[model samples]
Target: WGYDDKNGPEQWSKLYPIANGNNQSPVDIKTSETKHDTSLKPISVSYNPATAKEIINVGHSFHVNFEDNDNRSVLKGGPFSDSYRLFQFHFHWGSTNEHGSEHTVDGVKYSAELHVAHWNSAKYSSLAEAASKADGLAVIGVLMKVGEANPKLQKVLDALQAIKTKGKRAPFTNFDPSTLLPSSLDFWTYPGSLTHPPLYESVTWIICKESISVSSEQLAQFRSLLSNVEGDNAVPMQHNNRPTQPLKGRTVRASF
Candidate 1:
């Protein structure tokens, strides 16, 4: 009965008080109010194709895990005073063909959103330790659109078929995480938390202005995924986005 409304995001506050906290994630990004910070550098992402491991559906979402055993893959130089090591990347989408991304620009929603997660490995011993502090995490958000088939995204799309049901997984490798990002690095930055449970208020969000492309067929593969185990009356794993949270005086900064 989780996202079935019995335990949706609105009801998460019962245990995770931060659900209603001072700083929450997936906030509506009003562009006009965002400041252009000259001090902010173009975000830096150094990714390694070799670090790519396998993809897994962890019931809530599917994630492409990487070899974060060292700082082989990392993000830096964007609204950040420190570098955060790459951990995993995942997506959130809606049941429909449109409006699935968590954050919106001027309240405009996109078809999907991709979250690339990392942690401040320099100061934190583990993602767990970083999740508990305000400076521990950094997540990059990239919007997805219905356009030309994203050849770069095909590997991920193909893997989804094998992992259609919850807890399913498929071997994936030799892909660079950087290949999934937009060409323009212009982005909005702010303090926020994880969109899912525990909603840890520790992430520094970097959201790109441009969106990548995906075919309708590619997206349909994702929409049909299961949010639960296969035989338990599983529902389509769509509409996994959390509603926009309160910005609460947080100032969003842009690099360009």
Candidate 2:
């Protein structure tokens, strides 16, 4: 439910049985052990800036919602046989810049991670309908490294102040999510789950090999967000990311 010792990742499986299931997400990506798949095609993403609607503080992290009425903004190719519609995007961060990413490489943790969640509209009518079925969701994982300040991230960071507490929201429009991506689309593809509760093993994860830059100041802004509502005792939302899970003999294929 929460990231505290009393209600953290360790306590999730009790309420959601699927937390302990095989194919869980945020596993440590060991490049040395990954197989290069020649059949994997280059990822193709098309995002419409007009579809971006609102940004909301959802207790642990803030996410920007987008309209998914059609396939205007979608993810295609890559490891996917069909198109997946982009619906929402969020971030995971740590209290400090030292470590915060949900998915780690080898053993190195990044400053933060970005999750762009899409649903298979060709088969499922909605995100909720597709969330629990295998091969229903496709998430693009963009790891954020601590470096020069990313101007592209500034807009979202600036909007955070308006929704500092849980349940708060502000209008966020004309935002193209692709502006945050690195030039190269090379990634590691694997079958995994949602990193958090419900933990459904329905996601086809495509994690970018190159990381985007996030300044220390930007990371501090993310930590400043509150997990509680305006009336309750404020709890800073950080370390919202779950620790790396076991691989369980699953093969990680790389698109080079």
Candidate 3:
């Protein structure tokens, strides 16, 4: 349940059997081995600022929840056959800047990783229902490197003060998630699982090629979050990312 020696990624397979499944996620993107798919279409994302509801510290990390009642904020095209409703987005970082990202490029790790999760609303009624299906979820992975402070990311970091401990939440309204995207839409696509448990093999992973920036100070704010609630032994929320899994003969397609 946590990223400690007692219950980290290595022990997840004992509880969640799917953790050892073939199509597991966070696979290293060996660029040379990836195939350039000429037929792949550009991914489309349309999100409404009003759809952002709140930000909550969910023990391992924080999630910016969205209103997914309808297809107001949705992602389409790319490897998806129909539109997927935007649900929530979260991040994974390490205890230090040396290694944090779940997925790596040619054995290089980034400072952090962002997951913009969406559910296939066109085929399923709810996220819960969709989660169990093979083509149910689509996650956009954006890697982050250490550099100058990103002005757009500052807004989210500022709000972390209110929800510093696990289970704490605060109103996070009118936020446009698109502001965090890098200039390039080029990506690598593959069928994979949730990076964490219950590691269902339902996600169509769309990992963006270009990385965004995050300063050391901003990464510190992310590390400041607590895995424990107030009045408990305060454990810093760091190294919450799962390590890169084996590719297992899966083909990663490139959208260049």
Q: TM-score for all predictions?
A: 0.95, 0.98, 0.98
Q: Give the TM-score of candidate 3.
A: 0.98
Q: How well does candidate 2 score on lDDT at residue 86?
A: 97
State model 2's lDDT. 0.92
Clashing pairs in 1: none
Q: Give the per-residue lDDT of model 3 (tens digit) for 101-218.
A: 9999999999999999999999999999989789999899999999989898977999999998999999999987988888898989999999988999999999999999999988
Q: Tell me the TM-score of model 1.
A: 0.95
Comparing 1 and 3 by TM-score, which wins? 3
lDDT tens readout by residue for model 1, 48-165: 8888998998776789998888898999989788889998988888877778889888888888899999999989998878987899999999988877888988788878878877
Give Cα-based local distance difference scores for all models: 0.86, 0.92, 0.91
What does the lDDT read for residue 61 in candidate 2?
A: 81
Total residue pair clashes for candidate 3:
0
* Rank by TM-score (best first): 3, 2, 1
Per-residue lDDT of model 2, residues 28-57, tens digit only: 999999999989999999999999999999
Better of 1 and 2 by TM-score: 2
